[PDB]
Design an enzyme around this catalytic site. Structure first.
Site, PDB file in Angstrom:
ATOM      1  N   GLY A   1      -2.542  -7.034   8.510  1.00  0.00           N
ATOM      2  CA  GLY A   1      -3.135  -7.037   9.831  1.00  0.00           C
ATOM      3  C   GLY A   1      -4.343  -6.132   9.961  1.00  0.00           C
ATOM      4  N   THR A   2      -4.166  -4.845   9.652  1.00  0.00           N
ATOM      5  CA  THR A   2      -5.259  -3.892   9.817  1.00  0.00           C
ATOM      6  C   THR A   2      -6.371  -4.139   8.804  1.00  0.00           C
ATOM      7  OG1 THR A   2      -5.781  -1.540  10.032  1.00  0.00           O
ATOM      8  CG2 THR A   2      -4.213  -2.166   8.318  1.00  0.00           C
TER       9      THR A   2
ATOM     10  N   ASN B   1      -5.105  -1.498 -10.334  1.00  0.00           N
ATOM     11  CA  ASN B   1      -6.300  -0.938  -9.710  1.00  0.00           C
ATOM     12  C   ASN B   1      -7.332  -0.517 -10.750  1.00  0.00           C
ATOM     13  OD1 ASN B   1      -5.023  -1.216  -7.154  1.00  0.00           O
ATOM     14  ND2 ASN B   1      -3.975   0.741  -7.473  1.00  0.00           N
TER      15      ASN B   1
ATOM     16  N   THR C   1       4.109 -11.115  -1.004  1.00  0.00           N
ATOM     17  CA  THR C   1       5.013 -10.148  -0.391  1.00  0.00           C
ATOM     18  C   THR C   1       5.377 -10.492   1.048  1.00  0.00           C
ATOM     19  OG1 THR C   1       4.126  -8.377  -1.788  1.00  0.00           O
ATOM     20  CG2 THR C   1       5.334  -7.745   0.193  1.00  0.00           C
TER      21      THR C   1
ATOM     22  N   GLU D   1      -2.401   3.606   9.952  1.00  0.00           N
ATOM     23  CA  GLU D   1      -1.122   4.189   9.582  1.00  0.00           C
ATOM     24  C   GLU D   1      -1.375   5.363   8.652  1.00  0.00           C
ATOM     25  OE1 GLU D   1       0.901   3.845   6.479  1.00  0.00           O
ATOM     26  OE2 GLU D   1       2.515   4.966   7.457  1.00  0.00           O
TER      27      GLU D   1
ATOM     28  N   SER E   1      -7.612  -5.531   1.518  1.00  0.00           N
ATOM     29  CA  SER E   1      -6.689  -6.634   1.300  1.00  0.00           C
ATOM     30  C   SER E   1      -6.624  -7.494   2.554  1.00  0.00           C
ATOM     31  CB  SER E   1      -5.298  -6.115   0.941  1.00  0.00           C
ATOM     32  OG  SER E   1      -4.556  -5.800   2.105  1.00  0.00           O
TER      33      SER E   1
ATOM     34  N   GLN F   1      -4.341  -0.395   3.243  1.00  0.00           N
ATOM     35  CA  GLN F   1      -3.657   0.315   2.166  1.00  0.00           C
ATOM     36  C   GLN F   1      -4.144  -0.146   0.798  1.00  0.00           C
ATOM     37  OE1 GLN F   1       0.603   0.192   2.405  1.00  0.00           O
ATOM     38  NE2 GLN F   1       0.887   1.581   0.667  1.00  0.00           N
TER      39      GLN F   1
ATOM     40  N   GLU G   1     -30.938  -8.347  -6.633  1.00  0.00           N
ATOM     41  CA  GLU G   1     -31.035  -9.371  -7.670  1.00  0.00           C
ATOM     42  C   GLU G   1     -29.653  -9.806  -8.147  1.00  0.00           C
ATOM     43  OE1 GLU G   1     -33.463  -7.685 -10.692  1.00  0.00           O
ATOM     44  OE2 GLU G   1     -35.322  -7.836  -9.537  1.00  0.00           O
TER      45      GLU G   1
HETATM   46  N1  LIG Z   1      -4.023  -5.050  -5.936  1.00  0.00           N
HETATM   47  C1  LIG Z   1      -3.363  -4.353  -5.017  1.00  0.00           C
HETATM   48  N2  LIG Z   1      -2.934  -4.973  -3.860  1.00  0.00           N
HETATM   49  C2  LIG Z   1      -2.260  -4.272  -2.919  1.00  0.00           C
HETATM   50  C3  LIG Z   1      -1.996  -2.924  -3.108  1.00  0.00           C
HETATM   51  N3  LIG Z   1      -1.320  -2.477  -2.030  1.00  0.00           N
HETATM   52  C4  LIG Z   1      -1.155  -3.502  -1.166  1.00  0.00           C
HETATM   53  N4  LIG Z   1      -1.724  -4.624  -1.705  1.00  0.00           N
HETATM   54  C5  LIG Z   1      -1.774  -5.961  -1.087  1.00  0.00           C
HETATM   55  O1  LIG Z   1      -1.741  -5.844   0.322  1.00  0.00           O
HETATM   56  C6  LIG Z   1      -0.885  -6.818   0.884  1.00  0.00           C
HETATM   57  C7  LIG Z   1      -0.230  -6.300   2.160  1.00  0.00           C
HETATM   58  O2  LIG Z   1      -1.155  -5.583   2.948  1.00  0.00           O
HETATM   59  P1  LIG Z   1      -1.281  -3.992   2.767  1.00  0.00           P
HETATM   60  O3  LIG Z   1      -2.570  -3.644   2.065  1.00  0.00           O
HETATM   61  O4  LIG Z   1      -0.091  -3.481   1.995  1.00  0.00           O
HETATM   62  O5  LIG Z   1      -1.263  -3.377   4.252  1.00  0.00           O
HETATM   63  P2  LIG Z   1      -2.573  -3.442   5.179  1.00  0.00           P
HETATM   64  O6  LIG Z   1      -3.589  -4.399   4.605  1.00  0.00           O
HETATM   65  O7  LIG Z   1      -3.146  -2.053   5.314  1.00  0.00           O
HETATM   66  O8  LIG Z   1      -2.037  -3.961   6.604  1.00  0.00           O
HETATM   67  P3  LIG Z   1      -0.875  -3.152   7.366  1.00  0.00           P
HETATM   68  O9  LIG Z   1       0.442  -3.499   6.719  1.00  0.00           O
HETATM   69  O10 LIG Z   1      -0.841  -3.556   8.819  1.00  0.00           O
HETATM   70  O11 LIG Z   1      -1.122  -1.668   7.248  1.00  0.00           O
HETATM   71  C8  LIG Z   1       0.139  -7.132  -0.191  1.00  0.00           C
HETATM   72  O12 LIG Z   1       0.458  -8.503  -0.189  1.00  0.00           O
HETATM   73  C9  LIG Z   1      -0.544  -6.759  -1.488  1.00  0.00           C
HETATM   74  O13 LIG Z   1      -0.927  -7.925  -2.174  1.00  0.00           O
HETATM   75  C10 LIG Z   1      -2.424  -2.294  -4.267  1.00  0.00           C
HETATM   76  O14 LIG Z   1      -2.195  -1.101  -4.443  1.00  0.00           O
HETATM   77  N5  LIG Z   1      -3.110  -3.013  -5.222  1.00  0.00           N
HETATM   78 MG   LIG Z   2      -0.550  -0.402   5.609  1.00  0.00          MG
END
Ligand SMILES: Nc1nc2c(ncn2[C@@H]2O[C@H](COP(=O)(O)OP(=O)(O)OP(=O)(O)O)[C@@H](O)[C@H]2O)c(=O)[nH]1
Ligand SMILES: [Mg+2]
Ligand SMILES: Nc1nc2c(ncn2[C@@H]2O[C@H](COP(=O)(O)OP(=O)(O)O)[C@@H](O)[C@H]2O)c(=O)[nH]1
Ligand SMILES: Nc1nc2c(ncn2[C@@H]2O[C@H](COP(=O)(O)OP(=O)(O)O)[C@@H](O)[C@H]2O)c(=O)[nH]1
EC number: 3.6.5.-
Lengths: 53, 132, 432, 430, 430
Positions: free
Chosen positions: C137-138, C221, C172, C64, C133, C11, C247
């Site tokens: 998990g994913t 972002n 979070t 998801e 990120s 995400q 480079e």
């Molecule tokens: N900078 C930034 N970080 C994000 C954003 N959305 C989620 N995160 C980071 O992602 C972390 C949680 O993982 P997510 O990206 O929300 O979910 P995921 O990585 O797809 O893993 P799943 O929950 O299994 O789907 C949070 O602690 C956030 O720090 C975003 O829009 N901008």
């Molecule tokens: Mg997600």
């Protein structure tokens, strides 16, 4: 009737704090590019030598 | 994770909804801006049509809706290439590096501004020879 | 004729790629439907369809579907390739074993098929840019599997990852110290360059510079998108001093195991107070090295510097860059490593930065982006190791991982790998 | 007869070359379209040296442009004088050396040179009587130093008796743009001393100082620096294209400047150079040109000529002047500064006079001097190399493309050998 | 001017013909009232190939519509483009076939086929230079397979020189609409190998997966399947109706695709087929068309072409293009997939180019292939026949119309004989 609290004109949701300045609109509106200046270009580049005069 | 079959109308996010939304024959292919894309109610007392993608109706011969393909749909190589040697021009496609069309070709006025600017300007030819 | 392929997974990766593509479209003048109103600089990110629209060179992965469906139903539904938005049915639920052993194995084949189809069209493929990120998990699982597959499939193609590591205290999830370590193991042996983009540093930068007290993820972002654009502008805009992707890490990676780096951007300022300062080239480069304006929550004053790949865009002159570098060198508060006499790789470009309408930043005529490799980065790994050690002491949350097909002993091995990385960083930076 | 060919490689070499052809075309009255527009017959008298003749009467330069990426070669063709060069002489790769000497000399550069050696061989075969080659490249880059030094070796093998010129821009510590500059610069020196007959070194550090102080212009760019080098480059071959009281081609310069085979690294400078606001306060005479010629601040190298002893020096005068003035001035400077001139060789200054001054100048002077002060540059470059190599930093790139650490140590020994051998004559006495 | 006549029988044949005449009339810009409303003059010089001219300037197709019951031909008249066909070309009985081969071939077919033979002879003698016949029918039905194959034999007895094309819809065991298909499917195949010069088999099962997997339309009807066959059917004679660079008529296909007299069974395919959602995101080029045309899932038959080896294949390109790309891709696909092409014959692909693409597109490709894997389709039908015949199920109707078991035994013998004769080239080595 809610904007004037000193909490709607400061710290809004996802926006810069509202500081009510006024700019000179005769310039500054169309394509003004901030910064100090345009690194003023100097006269003559290759004609300092071979003066042509 | 397998493919489902049709159970819902093409307004929910159940699988294989994208193609049904793309089909212009369905009434559901064409939505409203105020449905979704709505910050708050009082912003607009209005509705507006937005449509979903830009797609032809027939799955085959899909290249329709392009005015360019309709024009050249009845042009033959002999018609294209053998017009008349008074008014015919080359149509072959060359290497891009050979058709660069450099700066002085783009704006020829710079060329006559040049030359007199630098060429044949302020020459001093003096030779110390006995006869000359 | 030089291309780059961007992979978005998770995400966070999707929600930063959306802003990145918005910014790129704004820069190149491409409308959301993909058409251009009225040379071929776009070729590094887009591809001509033959007649009209331009398709981005990106593929979206997730398990998801909500985040992907928003892309397919938003204002950018006419830009992306419909069959390049790959989505699943069930979330990974912040579990690494789910995305790497149970449900992530059924979609990597489709992802590699799409990547192969994209790369077969390209002719001058420079490398890959992967956004994900790490605390999810994913994001950690599919990212790890995809990197492992792409390495053995492509060989020597350079891969760059822009990873968002968990913040020191403001975070979070609660089990993210677990799955971050495993993905750190996976990426350490397969990526070429990693970037630190934690969340507190961006929050403090916003609060101090933009005077924004309630920032949302849209604001965060945009900074990342600006960083990516500044990094990549040398591939698509002519400049007085151009630098390519290859480079970058031949000048940033001394030893193969040390490729983690952190970035800074300057100037980041609003329109209300960018008029009371002149934003000269001499002062913007000082804010770049200022520790408080650093995009990673780390203290550069606690370690030595190895190499700084710092990029200028705008109307800078190679004259002024050298003087600023000399002043930075002669300053005492910044010290480099002993065995590196020259430590700056400078790049200059002509295209000024672009501002997205409705944004928060200013339309300045100068900007500098620095990618710095330093020894101070070990602190984040040490604190993550401590946080992991606090929980793992009594096997908390482990039955969720064991029950999804993963062996018990992976945590230990990852622990010794992070310990070895700590030892490497400690031994490299010592004086000779 | 006795014509020469031009080869340029890398970004730095291409920018130097793209301005040198601009300067030469102006002197001979050639517009960017290749049409003669001069006024005097002497302009067309010796055009065979640098230019070819094609059907329709257009002149094309005999230059070969090489590189490994189309980024810089696309800009040079899209700018002015892009139509001067023959489109088929543009040869380039698709990947790029990536600032890696091993890549530009072993893996990728060696693959490409099959094509470029063909056009160079064809160009040097069609000429009437070849005089020599000249190369423009930088020692701080990948493709410039990598392919550039390899091209010298193979051309030398095919033309053992011809002479070679190199206008090399070595990297100085004060202005650094790459972190692996000491590595590839050292490796380039190894092959350069073995093959190149004449080597001229240029410093971006010294060029800035000249443009800052002497010309007194505040904002130089790479455009202006390339012009300073271009003026000196055309000065060396000035007497080859115009008549003069004393004639001296490239070979004559080599004999009178090189005492021993391994000592062929020179420093160059140009005169007169005056600012716009102070150009009407000066008087152009031989006694004042020789003052600016020997000025230690006017040299294009960071080495201070007063930190050593001049083994020999040469001056190339252009314009209308008396030989009595020229000869008597070169004697006086040697007598007044006998300390700075080595004493086991008498009258170690050679003077040549050409009858045609440059564009828009009554008089001009080009100085080429061989001094022991050039050792300082190699010493400070080698100091940077030994600190980096003692930790094997960034060495996995070179060791990963077929070359081993044996070559790195061997190259360093030869470079250190050169300095020790070069400094020997500074303290040597008769 | 080498014009062909069209014969269609049964429900499936009439439905294909009804849709086929819609595409052709659309291509030529023909009003459903028979009036020409085209744009360019290229649409009228060859209109005599398919259409006949009558008083008032209206054009009437030369087609014969034949069946044993008026139910289906009431619908074809009332449907779109129903006014084109002449009312005198409808022939029908008042009873119907009832899925019985003998009834449509011995009792009711024999007493009615005299009338339909008259109109066919009337149309054939009207034309000056006859080109051949094309027949659309289905082998899984009564009046289609039965009465259709009786007319096929009759015409070949009268016109032995003209080429005969058939577009047969053979039954597929996966999707079943009738319980007596294996009987009358094998019987009519026995009568095709001695008469038909070209046979192009089609499966409804293959059509359904194409629409579901490629076009991704949820609820296709028979109108969609009818359209796919129509596009391929119209593309075969593209070079015979329009100018091009490499013309090729029907006889050029038969000579160039049939190595031996009993190997005239083909499989067809069309390109480019794309989903409605992703129509604008793919570029139409020769490399893309040539990749898709050879896809195993793009064929119109349930047989898998990668389980055998091609003997000969033909591709009929359409639209304005360049020949070098066309010629290089056929060589490229042949060399990379040499395992799928038999070795004792070289360069077993033909390329044909026409300069008129179909309406609503810019390029199109029709593929006709002769592959050893088409016998897998006959094996399934033959296997079902033996299981039903050994118990003599449903046999009393066939024996009740003067038909004996002896030609039931002959039908299975010749069917198996063809497969054995057709598979022994799969691994044959010269
Ligand atoms: N900078 C930034 N970080 C994000 C954003 N959305 C989620 N995160 C980071 O992602 C972390 C949680 O993982 P997510 O990206 O929300 O979910 P995921 O990585 O797809 O893993 P799943 O929950 O299994 O789907 C949070 O602690 C956030 O720090 C975003 O829009 N901008
Ligand atoms: Mg997600
Ligand atoms: N005089 C001059 N020097 C240049 C120019 N461009 C780059 N340089 C110098 O060359 C060095 C880098 O060499 P580079 O161009 O990368 O070599 P290459 O990779 O082989 O093309 C830098 O330190 C610059 O100071 C130019 O246009 N003129
Ligand atoms: N493609 C296609 N197939 C059809 C159509 N109508 C019927 N069929 C097929 O034809 C088969 C039955 O053939 P049938 O009409 O009984 O043959 P007939 O009795 O000789 O007319 C069924 O299995 C259908 O799948 C049609 O309009 N299009």
């Amino acid at each position: 009737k809610e904007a004037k609290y000193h909490s709607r004109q400061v710290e809004p949701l996802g926006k810069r704090m509202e500081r009510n300045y006024e700019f000179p609109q005769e310039v500054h509106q169309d394509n003004f590019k901030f910064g100090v200046a345009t690194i003023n270009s100097e006269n003559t580049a290759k004609e300092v030598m071979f003066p042509q005069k | 994770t397998t493919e489902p079959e049709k159970k819902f109308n093409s307004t929910v996010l159940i699988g294989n909804w994208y193609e049904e939304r793309c089909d212009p024959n369905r009434e559901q292919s064409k939505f409203y801006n105020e449905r979704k894309f709505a910050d708050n109610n009082y912003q607009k007392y209005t509705l507006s049509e937005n449509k979903f993608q830009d797609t032809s109706n027939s799955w085959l011969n899909f290249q329709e809706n392009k005015p360019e393909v309709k024009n050249d749909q009845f042009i033959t190589m002999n018609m294209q290439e053998y017009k008349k040697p008074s008014e015919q021009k080359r149509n072959s496609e060359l290497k891009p590096f050979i058709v660069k069309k450099s700066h002085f070709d783009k704006n020829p006025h710079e060329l006559e501004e040049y030359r007199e600017k630098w060429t044949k300007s302020a020459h001093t030819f003096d030779r110390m020879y006995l006869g000359t | 004729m030089r291309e780059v392929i961007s992979i978005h997974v998770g995400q966070g990766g999707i929600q930063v790629g959306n802003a990145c593509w918005e910014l790129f479209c704004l820069e190149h003048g491409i409308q959301p439907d993909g058409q251009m109103p009225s040379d071929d600089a776009f070729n590094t990110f887009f591809s001509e369809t033959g007649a009209g629209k331009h398709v981005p060179r990106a593929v979206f992965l997730d398990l998801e579907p909500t985040v992907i469906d928003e892309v397919r139903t938003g204002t950018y539904r006419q830009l992306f390739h419909p069959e390049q938005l790959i989505s699943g049915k069930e979330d990974a639920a912040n579990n690494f074993a789910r995305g790497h052993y149970t449900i992530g194995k059924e979609i990597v084949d489709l992802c590699l098929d799409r990547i192969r189809k994209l790369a077969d069209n390209c002719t001058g493929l420079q490398g890959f840019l992967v956004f994900n990120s790490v605390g999810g998990g994913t994001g950690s699982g599919l990212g790890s599997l995809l990197l492992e597959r792409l390495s053995v499939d492509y060989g020597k193609k350079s891969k760059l990852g822009f990873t968002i590591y968990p913040s020191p205290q403001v975070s979070t999830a609660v089990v993210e110290p677990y799955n971050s370590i495993l993905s750190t193991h996976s990426l350490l042996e397969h990526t070429d360059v990693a970037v630190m983009l934690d969340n507190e540093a961006i929050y403090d930068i916003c609060r101090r510079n933009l005077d924004i007290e309630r920032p949302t993820y849209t604001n965060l972002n945009r900074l990342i998108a600006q960083v990516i654009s500044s990094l990549t502008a040398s591939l698509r805009f002519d400049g007085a001093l151009n630098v390519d992707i290859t480079e970058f890490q031949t000048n940033l990676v001394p030893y193969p195991r040390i490729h983690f780096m952190l970035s800074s951007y300057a100037p980041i300022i609003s329109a209300e107070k960018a008029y009371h300062e002149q934003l000269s080239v001499a002062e913007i480069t000082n804010s770049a090295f200022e520790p408080a304006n650093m995009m990673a929550k780390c203290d550069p004053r606690h370690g030595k510097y190895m190499a700084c790949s710092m990029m200028y865009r705008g109307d800078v002159v190679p004259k002024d860059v050298n003087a600023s570098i000399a002043t930075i060198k002669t300053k005492r508060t910044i010290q480099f490593v002993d065995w590196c006499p020259t430590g700056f790789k400078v790049g200059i470009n002509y295209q000024p930065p672009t501002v997205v309408p409705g944004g928060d930043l200013a339309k300045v005529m100068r900007a500098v982006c620095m990618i710095s490799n330093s020894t101070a980065i070990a602190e984040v790994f040490s604190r993550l190791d401590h946080k992991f050690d606090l929980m793992y002491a009594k096997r908390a949350f482990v039955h969720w991982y064991v029950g999804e097909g993963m062996e018990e002993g992976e945590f230990s091995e990852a622990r010794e790998d992070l310990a070895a990385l700590e030892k490497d960083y400690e031994e490299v930076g010592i004086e000779t | 007869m006795r014509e020469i060919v031009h080869i340029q490689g890398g970004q730095c070499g291409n920018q130097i070359g793209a301005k040198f052809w601009e300067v030469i075309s102006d002197e001979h009255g050639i517009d960017p379209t290749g049409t003669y527009h001069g006024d005097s017959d002497l302009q067309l008298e010796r055009i065979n040296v640098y230019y070819n003749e094609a059907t329709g009467g257009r002149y094309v330069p005999r230059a070969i442009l090489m590189d490994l990426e189309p980024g810089t070669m696309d800009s040079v063709r899209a700018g002015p004088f892009g139509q001067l060069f023959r489109p088929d002489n543009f040869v380039f790769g698709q990947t790029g050396a990536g600032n890696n000497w091993a890549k530009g000399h072993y893996t990728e550069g060696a693959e490409l040179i099959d094509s470029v050696l063909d056009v160079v061989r064809k160009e040097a075969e069609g000429c009437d009587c070849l005089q020599g080659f000249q190369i423009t490249h930088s020692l701080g880059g990948g493709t410039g130093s990598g392919m550039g030094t390899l091209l010298i070796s193979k051309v030398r093998e095919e033309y053992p008796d011809r002479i070679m010129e190199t206008f090399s821009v070595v990297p100085s510590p004060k202005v650094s743009d790459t972190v692996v500059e000491p590595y590839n610069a050292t490796l380039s020196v190894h092959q350069l001393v073995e093959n190149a007959d004449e080597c001229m070194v240029i410093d971006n550090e010294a060029l800035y100082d000249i443009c800052f102080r002497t010309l007194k212009l505040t904002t130089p760019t790479y455009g202006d620096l390339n012009h300073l080098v271009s003026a000196a480059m055309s000065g060396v071959t000035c007497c080859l294209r115009f008549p003069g009281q004393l004639n001296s081609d490239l070979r004559k310069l080599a004999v009178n400047l090189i005492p021993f085979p391994r000592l062929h690294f020179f420093m160059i400078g140009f005169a007169p150079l005056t600012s716009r606001g102070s150009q009407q306060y000066r008087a152009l005479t031989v006694p004042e040109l020789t003052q600016q010629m020997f000025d230690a601040k006017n040299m294009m190298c960071a080495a201070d000529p007063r930190h050593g002893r001049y083994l020999t020096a040469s001056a190339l005068f252009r314009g209308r002047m008396s030989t009595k003035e020229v000869d008597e001035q070169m004697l006086n400077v040697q007598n007044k500064n006998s300390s700075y001139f080595v004493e086991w060789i008498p009258n170690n200054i050679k003077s040549s006079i050409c009858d045609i001054p440059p564009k828009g100048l009554k008089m001009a002077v080009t100085f080429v001097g061989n001094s022991t002060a050039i050792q300082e540059m190699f010493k400070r470059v080698a100091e940077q190399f030994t600190a980096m190599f003692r930790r094997k930093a960034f060495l996995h790139w070179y060791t990963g493309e077929g070359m081993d650490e044996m070559e790195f140590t061997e190259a360093e020994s030869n470079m250190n050998d050169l300095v020790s051998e070069y400094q020997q004559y500074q303290d040597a006495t008769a």
